[PDB]
Amino acid sequence: QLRSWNPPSESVDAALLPNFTRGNARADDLVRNNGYAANAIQLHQDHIVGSFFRLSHRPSWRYLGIGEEEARAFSREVEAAWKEFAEDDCCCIDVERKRTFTMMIREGVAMHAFNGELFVQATWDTSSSRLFRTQFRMVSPKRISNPNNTGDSRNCRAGVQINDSGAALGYYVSEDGYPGWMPQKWTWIPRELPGGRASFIHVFEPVEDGQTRGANVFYSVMEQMKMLDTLQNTQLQSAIVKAMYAATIESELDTQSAMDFILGANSQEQRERLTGWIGEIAAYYAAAPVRLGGAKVPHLMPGDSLNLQTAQDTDNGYSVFEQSLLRYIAAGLGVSYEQLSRNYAQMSYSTARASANESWAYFMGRRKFVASRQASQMFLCWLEEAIVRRVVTLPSKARFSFQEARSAWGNCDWIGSGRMAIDGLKEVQEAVMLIEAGLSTYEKECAKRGDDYQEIFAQQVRETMERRAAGLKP
Amino acid sequence: QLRSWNPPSESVDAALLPNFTRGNARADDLVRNNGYAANAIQLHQDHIVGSFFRLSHRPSWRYLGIGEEEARAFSREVEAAWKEFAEDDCCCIDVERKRTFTMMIREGVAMHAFNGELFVQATWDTSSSRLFRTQFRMVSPKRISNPNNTGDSRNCRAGVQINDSGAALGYYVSEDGYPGWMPQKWTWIPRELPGGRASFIHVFEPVEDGQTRGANVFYSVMEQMKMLDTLQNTQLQSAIVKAMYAATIESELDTQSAMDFILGANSQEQRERLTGWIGEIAAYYAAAPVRLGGAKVPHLMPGDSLNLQTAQDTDNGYSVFEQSLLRYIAAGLGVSYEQLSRNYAQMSYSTARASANESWAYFMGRRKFVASRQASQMFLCWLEEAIVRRVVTLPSKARFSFQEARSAWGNCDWIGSGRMAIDGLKEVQEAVMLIEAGLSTYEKECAKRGDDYQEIFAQQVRETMERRAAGLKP
Amino acid sequence: QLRSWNPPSESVDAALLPNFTRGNARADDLVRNNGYAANAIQLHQDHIVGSFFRLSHRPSWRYLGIGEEEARAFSREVEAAWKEFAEDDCCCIDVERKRTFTMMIREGVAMHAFNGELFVQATWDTSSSRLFRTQFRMVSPKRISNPNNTGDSRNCRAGVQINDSGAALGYYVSEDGYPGWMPQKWTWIPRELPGGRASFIHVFEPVEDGQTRGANVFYSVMEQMKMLDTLQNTQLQSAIVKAMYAATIESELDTQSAMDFILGANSQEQRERLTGWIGEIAAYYAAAPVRLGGAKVPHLMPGDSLNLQTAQDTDNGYSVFEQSLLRYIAAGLGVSYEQLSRNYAQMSYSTARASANESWAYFMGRRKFVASRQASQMFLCWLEEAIVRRVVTLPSKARFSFQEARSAWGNCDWIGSGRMAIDGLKEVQEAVMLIEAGLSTYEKECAKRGDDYQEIFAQQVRETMERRAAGLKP
């Protein structure tokens, strides 16, 4: 059996680049048409990032030798600039001016999930109408290709130029080709600016050394979606044919040897027999109208009888079939089966919680490794621009300048939508015991609930002093 | 039975090296295409290490005879350097610069899982743009082979050079072969530098003396995956064939002996007996359209009736069978059946905890024996570089230098994504009872939650004096 | 029945040695290719040993007449040396230099489980780069054989040399035979050094007097694995044949006596009838295309009908039979059915924990009798080396020297992976109830959890004083 299957060994790029375009096209097709694909990418959307994506700046004051309170004041100021820069109504952060930062992260993560990678370009606007001239534009991966669709080489594969070590030196971005009446042109974009500023950002997850383009997850399930739909159509046709109404009027006649003799006679000169019998039958059944259903039952030839036998006549087993399928696609896509297919039948509380736990662990992994990095990239660019314009002020006793210690100044962590309770009470008690018994601290409790404890404390103070100012019990 | 099965006895390498390449290729195909393979590798990916892999430096001050507080201060300093070195935005730890340390470990453990081994190379960069010039590049196992694909020898087996005892003196690494238009070129790399610094790290699990290359786990379950997909295809085929529908109009005539007489007449001179008769049929049905549905019933020869007989007519037994194969796969891969299969029916709480326990024990075993060793090697190299540059200062009265006692100075333990709650109350009660009863110490319960007690205490102190500074109840 | 079964009575060695090689080969094939065998081996690995194997030195100060506090200080010193010697990153304890002590014990236990025995060789290195020159290397049992494959004698059996009483005087170890182009050469290794130092260690479990080689457990289940595999294959074939579909176009003709007459005519000179009928049928059905699906329906000669009959049309009982085989395998392998096969269906808490308890008692027995003995041997060798180099210091008033009382000084016990909780609360209640009720002491509570009371007390003290130094509630 196994002797009939000898797949060759090639590097990941060797096994991916030749069919990269068709794979991306098929992934887009499933995303656009298939319902489950849209559902799954949608769960990825509202769970990796969720409703909002809040920043929290955590400068490494110890490394920079900066007073901790000074670092806290600096972080407060940079956050003050940042949120008002991010959620601007004008969408000025986007050069295209239709998306804000939250759906920036959303589009990025969904784009990576369904294509394997994401590309962001940071541009320096010239308009002075805004304090910040740094804007961002997403580049769809299909716009990244070799110029003139030339064959790839050692240092030029799939539109990205590499060095000896495989590091990306730059990219070839193709302009829009819509409508198909103009020839696409490719522009060379260096990966980063000479000053170290990240002009272009490419974020994806590699599985081995030398991989240059990410692989969408759908590569493992496309076939399964196909047997799924084909199962749908064939089961529909089974239902259709299961209600077939076969009914006919027939006459036995056809007198065997005399049937052959009558056939010979009719062929010779005796078609009159057949014609007269047909006429008599027509007259009789036009006097009759035997209408079994809504129509006249057809009349058949002498010796001709309708025969429609079928295949196996048992239960098809559709239920367990598509159960196994949906389970397969759910496993391939890394999300729990029940939430993918919203089939919560006979499900226990503990078991549902465990499944949600597994999916949540996967989801935090992806959020940490995909959304966080890209968000940190834009944050670094914007903070560099802000310090350039002195919107914020560095500490006077800074051990290093911003350029030397970009990571140190820019050390930031992002909080998305928290884990939302299955039941509420049990996890609330969890937080209460954790915070009271010393195994936990308020910041992470607000983190898994999608909050920050600073403004929480400030608002609690305000609530208390208002309540006591109004005579209410604090 | 047993008399027909007489497998010979050979050394593990003798039974693995000849088919090593095809085995790795088959495993790569399985993970790339099959959904369950991807789900299993992802489960390994997020359970062995998970979201993040935090270091804890525990120098053996007693062996070195160093004051414990001095050791703690040194550990704090080296950790402060290490975090800012590891999660750098620039990905400067990677030679090629796409990956940070956490995905370094993740890719390493995944490669070990689906290939049986992993290879890391430490390079000394010449660029002064960064404080640390030590960079890391992984090598796929497929790039390790004998130069020019020469015949295997005693001291040169699959690209690794061994001594008389078999110790890995060095390796032969092949260059990238994409595109396939150039001869590959092999480089000799010594295992370690002359100064004892680990230049090349090879991490795998050996099962016996003399094994030189690891074996992927899938080697136990490949044919089971194949019978699985063949089951999918044949069950689909059954679904199609059981909706099959046949409907034909036939006439008998042909009274055996009369059939033979008609055959003789038609062969001699009377073909017009049939064609004209057919025409007569073709006449009437022109006005018939006897439509079962949207189609037209085909007509048959006289005495020719379709007979579609079939095989057994009972239940295929799909539901038990594919479940059994899924259990086989989970047993082979060392993970619980429900997590891999994403099947959670009738799944009791206590037995859910039992499955989680088995999987968790396996995961901690592999994390200790695979990820921890690689991380320790990486950390040792970086620490050597840091001491070289005096970024961190050794204790003045140290009993031994760093070179003499590299293990003593670099004694470190890593905490990853800890075991996370199944019910919430039960495990938190465990923690509180254990801490209050004296059977536990804060750090290890922080560890199974993926925290450390030191920064937790510091953050609790900060929360406390912030709250008392704002008038809140402490 | 019983009259057809008269097995002869021979000694265990007489019934094992002739087929020992092929038995080991078959066991190796089973573990390499079958998933269940690998799962059972991995279970043995995880539970018998676990993540780590921690030493605890318990010198018999009473027998040696030494002050108990002096014994405690000595044990602390030797333990401090032992940990830093054992888990060294360089793997210097291993001659082959890939394995640390923990996976050494794991290799030993798995080796014994799947082969019935294990062999360790302690070598005295000459390199001064390390303080300890004692290294260890494992010897595969297949490397232990009579020189030149000569027939076994009274005092020479399977490469071992026995005295009059059967005690192992020495061994014959064969060199590696890979690649198979060299002739194997056998070396004589004395069991122990002239000074009583254990040069070579052979660990196995004997069932009767005179047994020289251990027998792997798999001997009891091999053919059961085999009919399990055949069951899988035949169930697959049943699934395929159950979707088999036969549908062709037939006729009757065959006019009995006139059929024979037509046969005679065609044989003599009248094949024209058959040829013309075939041509007419082909033309008509090329005008017809009567297709069941996307395929054309085949045709047959007159009087020829496809006749297929299966056999029986009942359930195969696959599920229950497979459960029976799995339970058989688990019983033969000493593990519970539900962990080997990961079947926690409809399983109660109490019943599951009882079965786990049975398996755990089995596993404690093996850990005591297999891993502990080998670990003690290696520890004794290392301790002898350490005393030789005065790394540690014996008590001044020692009643006996180290050589005279090796067991007394080296009395040690090893703690592996602790008992793993099923529910959490109940076992923690057990611990607290025993500890405050006076029926238990802290070390055994730390034992079924894999800790020790000394360092846990030290850590609790450190935590308490840190918390009091930070103003936290102690």
Side-chain angles (χ1 to χ4, degrees), chain B residues 95-146:
Chain B
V95 197
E96 174 288 340
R97 301 253 303 218
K98 39 223 173 303
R99 273 160 304 193
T100 89
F101 178 74
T102 309
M103 61 225 67
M104 291 305 337
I105 309 298
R106 290 177 72 99
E107 224 182 21
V109 58
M111 197 167 22
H112 155 54
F114 84 84
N115 274 347
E117 55 202 342
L118 67 90
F119 297 86
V120 192
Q121 185 191 15
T123 62
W124 188 258
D125 186 17
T126 60
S127 311
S128 200
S129 52
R130 319 143 199 143
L131 201 33
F132 294 112
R133 292 172 187 181
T134 294
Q135 313 197 291
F136 294 108
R137 157 199 274 214
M138 315 222 278
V139 179
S140 168
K142 324 172 311 173
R143 303 187 56 198
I144 304 304
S145 74
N146 297 350

Side-chain angles (χ1 to χ4, degrees), chain B residues 23-24 30 77 93 120 125 146 194 285 321 324 331 333 337 351:
Chain B
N24 282 355
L30 253 204
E77 187 194 3
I93 65 134
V120 192
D125 186 17
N146 297 350
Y285 292 92
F321 200 25
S324 69
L333 301 201
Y337 154 73
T351 65

Side-chain angles (χ1 to χ4, degrees), chain C residues 283-459:
Chain C
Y284 190 101
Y285 284 100
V290 47
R291 302 175 193 169
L292 84 82
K296 173 61 176 199
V297 172
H299 221 302
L300 282 300
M301 329 314 288
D304 299 76
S305 44
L306 179 32
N307 173 29
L308 70 96
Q309 55 251 44
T310 88
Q312 302 77 240
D313 255 33
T314 54
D315 177 23
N316 61 346
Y318 171 77
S319 58
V320 55
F321 195 38
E322 141 187 338
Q323 305 336 277
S324 79
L325 278 315
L326 262 306
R327 242 172 293 108
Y328 192 119
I329 277 45
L333 279 200
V335 311
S336 90
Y337 153 74
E338 65 281 4
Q339 63 213 130
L340 151 71
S341 66
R342 46 214 58 243
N343 212 328
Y344 301 172
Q346 50 73 65
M347 174 26 46
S348 98
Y349 152 73
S350 40
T351 324
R353 73 151 310 173
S355 189
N357 289 350
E358 271 336 277
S359 86
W360 180 266
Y362 173 87
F363 267 24
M364 301 334 307
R366 218 63 28 67
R367 170 198 293 193
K368 175 62 221 74
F369 303 136
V370 174
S372 317
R373 191 141 178 76
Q374 146 188 345
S376 297
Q377 298 300 325
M378 321 185 58
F379 167 61
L380 280 170
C381 293
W382 170 85
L383 167 38
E384 187 169 8
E385 180 191 30
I387 291 285
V388 155
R389 298 184 166 273
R390 324 166 330 282
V391 184
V392 279
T393 304
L394 273 170
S396 59
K397 77 158 191 321
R399 186 174 169 206
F400 312 116
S401 76
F402 173 78
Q403 311 283 349
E404 311 150 320
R406 290 211 243 253
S407 305
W409 300 111
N411 174 54
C412 58
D413 37 20
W414 309 80
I415 178 174
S417 34
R419 190 110 213 276
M420 158 91 107
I422 166 62
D423 82 81
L425 291 293
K426 305 334 147 301
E427 326 79 316
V428 163
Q429 294 339 284
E430 302 326 325
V432 57
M433 211 56 38
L434 287 282
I435 196 54
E436 53 84 20
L439 305 310
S440 204
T441 68
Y442 278 124
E443 33 275 37
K444 324 182 291 329
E445 286 89 67
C446 297
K448 36 205 183 298
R449 303 212 289 93
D451 316 50
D452 172 288
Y453 77 58
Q454 301 270 57
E455 80 289 351
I456 207 181
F457 280 173
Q459 189 38 67

Side-chain angles (χ1 to χ4, degrees), chain A residues 1-3 5-11 14-15 17 68 72 152 154 157 165-168 191 204 206-209 211 219-220 227 234 238 241 244 264 271 274 299-301 303-316 320-321 324 327-328 330-332 335-337 346-347 350-351 353-355 357-358 361-362 368-369 373 377 380 407 426 430 433-434 438-439 441-444 453 457 460-461, chain B residues 21-22 25-26 29 31-36 38-39 42-43 46-47 50-51 88-89 91 96-100 102-103 106-107 137-140 142-143 176 178-179 182 222-223 226 235-236 239-252 258 273 277 280 284-285 292 299 306-308 310 313 318 340-347 349 420-425 428 442 449 451 456 459-460 462-463 466-467 470 472:
Chain A
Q1 166 278 324
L2 71 173
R3 335 298 315 127
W5 173 63
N6 318 63
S9 46
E10 330 84 347
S11 62
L17 301 179
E68 181 159 359
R72 292 185 208 179
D152 48 355
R154 282 290 319 308
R157 317 191 189 161
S165 312
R191 172 155 166 270
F204 81 105
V207 308
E208 104 302 333
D209 43 359
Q211 157 173 1
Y219 257 77
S220 288
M227 308 128 285
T234 179
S238 99
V241 81
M244 281 306 268
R271 294 146 270 271
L274 310 170
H299 185 300
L300 257 288
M301 301 325 88
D304 289 73
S305 42
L306 189 37
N307 162 258
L308 80 182
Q309 82 275 20
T310 188
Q312 294 81 340
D313 214 67
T314 85
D315 168 45
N316 60 345
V320 317
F321 199 154
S324 75
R327 229 173 262 97
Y328 192 113
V335 314
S336 89
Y337 148 71
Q346 61 67 64
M347 182 23 46
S350 40
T351 323
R353 174 161 141 61
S355 207
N357 287 348
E358 253 318 312
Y362 171 81
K368 174 62 221 73
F369 299 133
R373 190 144 173 76
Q377 297 302 324
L380 283 170
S407 307
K426 322 311 300 311
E430 288 333 321
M433 311 285 328
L434 263 288
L439 306 313
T441 39
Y442 285 108
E443 77 279 357
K444 324 173 311 313
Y453 75 95
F457 283 174
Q460 163 75 294
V461 164
Chain B
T21 302
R22 66 141 210 183
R26 285 174 173 182
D29 181 18
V31 47
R32 156 166 190 255
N33 293 324
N34 184 284
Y36 293 131
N39 170 49
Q42 164 44 269
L43 288 208
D46 274 18
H47 273 282
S51 85
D88 202 333
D89 47 38
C91 277
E96 174 288 340
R97 301 253 303 218
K98 39 223 173 303
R99 273 160 304 193
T100 89
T102 309
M103 61 225 67
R106 290 177 72 99
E107 224 182 21
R137 157 199 274 214
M138 315 222 278
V139 179
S140 168
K142 324 172 311 173
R143 303 187 56 198
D176 164 48
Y178 184 86
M182 72 297 279
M222 311 185 48
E223 71 305 18
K226 314 293 211 153
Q235 163 44 99
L236 162 44
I240 313 310
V241 81
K242 252 180 58 133
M244 191 65 28
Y245 170 51
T248 180
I249 172 56
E250 85 96 18
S251 77
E252 155 66 21
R273 269 208 196 175
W277 205 260
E280 282 173 346
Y284 177 110
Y285 292 92
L292 61 94
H299 218 293
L306 193 161
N307 161 277
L308 85 85
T310 185
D313 218 26
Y318 185 48
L340 154 57
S341 69
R342 213 152 303 281
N343 190 4
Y344 274 12
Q346 47 74 65
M347 183 46 257
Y349 161 70
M420 51 66 77
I422 173 51
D423 165 277
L425 285 314
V428 169
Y442 282 106
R449 295 212 281 85
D451 316 50
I456 285 326
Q459 183 45 68
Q460 155 84 337
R462 175 171 323 113
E463 267 164 16
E466 282 165 308
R467 287 197 45 121
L472 276 81

Side-chain angles (χ1 to χ4, degrees), chain A residues 112-252 258 264-265 270-401:
Chain A
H112 159 50
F114 96 81
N115 277 348
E117 57 201 342
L118 68 94
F119 296 86
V120 187
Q121 181 191 16
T123 62
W124 187 261
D125 186 17
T126 59
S127 312
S128 83
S129 53
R130 318 145 198 146
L131 205 34
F132 294 112
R133 292 172 187 181
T134 293
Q135 312 196 292
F136 300 97
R137 159 198 276 212
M138 280 198 197
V139 177
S140 172
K142 35 197 319 203
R143 302 188 54 196
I144 299 314
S145 76
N146 299 352
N148 322 325
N149 330 295
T150 59
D152 48 355
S153 75
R154 282 290 319 308
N155 303 13
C156 193
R157 317 191 189 161
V160 53
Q161 202 85 45
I162 80 166
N163 63 350
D164 70 21
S165 312
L169 306 172
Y171 306 84
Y172 291 100
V173 47
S174 81
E175 72 210 11
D176 153 30
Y178 179 84
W181 317 120
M182 72 295 278
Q184 297 84 350
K185 310 307 295 166
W186 291 260
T187 315
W188 163 264
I189 293 313
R191 172 155 166 270
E192 80 289 336
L193 285 188
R197 175 176 158 145
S199 149
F200 211 78
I201 305 104
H202 172 205
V203 175
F204 81 105
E205 177 301 325
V207 308
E208 104 302 333
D209 43 359
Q211 157 173 1
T212 56
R213 305 293 294 265
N216 63 78
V217 47
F218 292 97
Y219 257 77
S220 288
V221 282
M222 291 135 68
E223 322 95 310
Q224 278 70 10
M225 329 283 278
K226 293 322 221 303
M227 308 128 285
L228 195 32
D229 53 86
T230 52
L231 171 35
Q232 313 294 30
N233 324 60
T234 179
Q235 165 58 62
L236 180 66
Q237 313 333 319
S238 99
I240 289 301
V241 81
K242 211 141 204 213
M244 281 306 268
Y245 185 12
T248 178
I249 272 297
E250 85 96 20
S251 78
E252 159 289 337
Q270 276 211 323
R271 294 146 270 271
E272 39 85 34
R273 281 200 207 170
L274 310 170
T275 59
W277 269 76
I278 288 311
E280 286 163 342
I281 273 157
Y284 184 90
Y285 294 118
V290 47
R291 185 150 285 93
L292 241 193
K296 164 46 64 171
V297 159
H299 185 300
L300 257 288
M301 301 325 88
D304 289 73
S305 42
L306 189 37
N307 162 258
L308 80 182
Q309 82 275 20
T310 188
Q312 294 81 340
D313 214 67
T314 85
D315 168 45
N316 60 345
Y318 173 49
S319 92
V320 317
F321 199 154
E322 42 64 39
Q323 283 324 301
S324 75
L325 270 293
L326 276 294
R327 229 173 262 97
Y328 192 113
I329 310 77
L333 295 199
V335 314
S336 89
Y337 148 71
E338 69 286 0
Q339 83 204 130
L340 162 64
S341 73
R342 48 218 56 247
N343 186 6
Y344 294 0
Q346 61 67 64
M347 182 23 46
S348 99
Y349 154 73
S350 40
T351 323
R353 174 161 141 61
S355 207
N357 287 348
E358 253 318 312
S359 46
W360 185 253
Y362 171 81
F363 274 18
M364 310 305 98
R366 324 311 320 290
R367 170 195 293 196
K368 174 62 221 73
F369 299 133
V370 184
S372 317
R373 190 144 173 76
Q374 157 195 357
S376 299
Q377 297 302 324
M378 291 157 268
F379 173 62
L380 283 170
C381 294
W382 168 86
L383 184 178
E384 187 174 10
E385 182 195 29
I387 292 195
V388 154
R389 294 180 164 270
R390 322 171 329 282
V391 189
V392 281
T393 303
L394 273 172
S396 58
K397 65 212 199 52
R399 186 174 168 206
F400 312 114
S401 77

